[PDB]
Symmetry: C6
Subunit: 202 residues, 6 copies
């Protein structure tokens, strides 16, 4: 990554490398993996971002879909930012330079520490997160329409499943509740908070 000592390059740590590998192994593409990726890739160069992605052993269907999203975003960058070099001067980054495939670590450091900075690490992380959100959505197992409260299921456990599913996918909470809780929630009226609904069906 690039961090303050002045902004300088540091090697990606074994702790960071191990943390990302283990979260993907344990959680796959559950929605909470994306905030973890963003946090573990704080200050990351494009090289560091590729390192994190390439160290993942499984899920190569997802990793191939991520490449497609990256190539789509890279092509859109080139359309908006065409490139035209002067000896010892900074070249303009194309899409593949931002993605780390045609740029060196020194060029990436040169862009990220410039004044004003050309934040190639943050631009590329945005493309990666965009691709990761699409993977989270596709690998979401259930529709919100099929999350309904069981006859003896606690309302809290049902609401956990409801908003877990909604997070992966992205009135109905009351409609999908069981007969006993639904009748209570209808009686509360409009403008009921989640807290009040959960207290009522407790």
């Amino acid at each position: 990554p690039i961090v303050q000592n002045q902004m300088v390059h540091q090697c990606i740590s074994p702790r960071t490398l191990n943390a990302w590998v283990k979260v993907v192994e344990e959680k796959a593409f559950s929605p909470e993996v994306i905030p973890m990726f963003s946090a573990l890739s704080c200050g990351a160069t494009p090289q560091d971002l590729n390192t994190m992605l390439n160290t993942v052993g499984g899920h190569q269907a997802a990793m191939q879909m991520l490449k497609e999203t990256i190539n789509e975003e890279a092509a859109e960058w080139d359309r908006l930012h065409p490139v035209h070099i002067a000896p010892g001067q900074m070249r303009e980054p194309r899409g593949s330079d931002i993605a780390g495939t045609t740029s060196t670590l020194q060029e990436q450091i040169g862009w990220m520490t410039h004044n004003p900075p050309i934040p190639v690490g943050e631009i590329y992380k945005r493309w990666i997160i965009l691709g990761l959100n699409k993977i989270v959505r596709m690998y979401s197992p259930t529709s919100i329409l099929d999350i309904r409260q069981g006859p003896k299921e606690p309302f809290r456990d049902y609401v956990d499943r409801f908003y877990k599913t909604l997070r992966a996918e992205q009135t109905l909470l009351v409609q999908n509740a069981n007969p006993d809780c639904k009748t209570i929630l209808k009686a509360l009226g409009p403008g009921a908070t989640l807290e009040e609904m959960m207290t009522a069906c407790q």
Copy 2:
């Protein structure tokens, strides 16, 4: 977080990220989780606070209730602190800026390191802890009225359950004691310390 090197931004560590995720997995919303959250979020930016909250996989009913509390506190901030920009100058933070949803990391750093400082991280942590305390209270399984000493239960074990329940929820200690210990505690008289009561029923 923001820490002294002069006050500068540092990346949230894998250790901090992992610690928060594991305590929530192991303890859910037991009352002791809130002091752990506050300690792990020492010097945290609003971005860091969102990172910690968003990395939690389960408990999405609770996380949705937390958003409602955050929105309520954000709306109250806007009522008390209305916003009105001058090129290259610091804008006034609204509720959603304090919550990290409409503010950038650089703006958050700008507020937190200003002289005098506008501590958006500490203001937002206060809102989060307020919301977390409400969740702790709702998820408390038992009323203090139902914590009574068993016939053969040690007084120490009963007092542990009593103040555990009282912590989650928030004369009666003697009333809820068993016949044998109650008679001893009545004989001690007024002004008895917990130490003296526990020694007496040992």
Copy 3:
């Protein structure tokens, strides 16, 4: 804590937070927990000391007894050190300020880094350790009078139990020994060291 970089504030580490939580989980209030608490709270502010105490999930009977001891010591501080402010000047700490309940982190830093320093962290740790020693003594399961050597118990194992019990509670070593070892220890005479007694009954 407060440490040398000049004396500056540092965030309590996840390692320290985790270490204290796990020792209490594994050892409860065995006497060796108190030296571990003191070491883990090296340079601790009153806020840090409260953090460590409040992160403990179980043992709320003990934690309530600790509050009583803290309030007793705080009341004794106020009797000896009554408080009387001048703009931008340091106020005098009362008992509740030393205990971290009515003081801010900045005030605690202000006292601890003053010249001369008002060491509120060390004063409060003294009160906490005083309260923790009382808890260790009450939770000690056995009297030293009931620690006697078994017919086939090795003398070393008996001496381990003897001084383990004595540590928790706080001639008799010979009296509580078994017939065979007692006869040997009587024959050694006065002024026998523990080493010599243990070698004799080996």
Copy 4:
């Protein structure tokens, strides 16, 4: 490694040493091991690279093949860069000096921190990765021709196996699909993205 404090030598950490040993033990020569090697050897001297390779206990067939690749690349370096010393001056590195077998740590530091730098660590890592890719390819168990979707296998699981195999080895995705999914994928037409194909056979 060599890192910024000015560029200075640091000892390879126990964490780095342990991380490399464990990944090889757990993953053998799965393709994702090579990006992990490159990341863990960030800033590595030739001595550090040899340390990492020599600490591997098993897989001595692979380690011997790696030596052959290293010797081939070293011989090609000597053909392109023949060596010709002046007291207290920097000598030109031959292939075996880049590989760390005939050079000292001080000479390696001298080359890597020169202005302009002769990056012997990065040149040698390139040779090692070249040799490691050949080992990954040989130890790949299955041809892409033999990765075909099962009658009841989910398309996602089949695509995972397909691109896992393709990564180790390096129209057909549709041909190797099962009758039901193949018919759907043919109906999509040309220019179908992986996302669209995976959604169609879901």
Copy 5:
């Protein structure tokens, strides 16, 4: 401990605290525990040394014997170095000051960082190691006279037991060997190295 930043005090780390506690739990008073103690207490103040000793939960017979040795060495220090204060000046350390029982942390820092330094940490560690060696010797289970090679025991395994026992306790190697190996070792003659003896009976 006291370390270079100029020599300054640092808090004993949770890693050091945990390491010492676990080695004592796992190894008891096997001889290799003493070099581990010395290494973990590198730069330690008398307070740090007491912390390490006091954090040990079991083995209170041994810890009491250690106190006796410490008191003996402290009494011998007072005989050789009698003490006689001038405002704001450094007092002379007595035995109990070196042992950390009657000295403060600031006085210990004052002695250890003086020019010339009065190394109270190293003097006390010497006394502790002296006491720990006596405990290792007493808790050694077997005499070297009873370490004899079995009929089918490999010579290497026998030599391991022989020098393990000799280390705990502190021609005979040949005498205690089995008939077959003894005859071979007699035939080698005088001046045989351990390597040669072990190769011969392999």
Copy 6:
């Protein structure tokens, strides 16, 4: 160890101490332990090297053989470098000073940080590694002559055993192969690389 802050002494870390102890416990004297020792002892003083060796609990036959090698190398040093002191000046190191038995830590620091430096840590590590290689060779269980490919053993698994044994001990690869693979390898002709031989018998 001695490291750059200027070259200064640092305490050996608990991580380094633990790493060396565990590798010896897990791997004994497999050849890969020697590169791990060298890496973990980077910048080590003679005191640090003794610490690492003395913290090993088992294998006292091997540790005694290591002392013999150390004494042999120390005696050879004294023959080549005889010693002859001037107040406040650096004395010449004898063999036992390099081995850390008759030298203090300050003298070791004095030699290692001199200009020009007398690298007593690196000289002693060389002697230790020499002794460790002899132990690896003696504890090697099998001769390379007895490593032959099984009737149904994969060639890769056989080559792994072959070069594993060769590493511990230090045309035949083809001779020791099974009838089917041997016939294939003979047909390849002279100048066949290991890669080509392994591909042929796959």
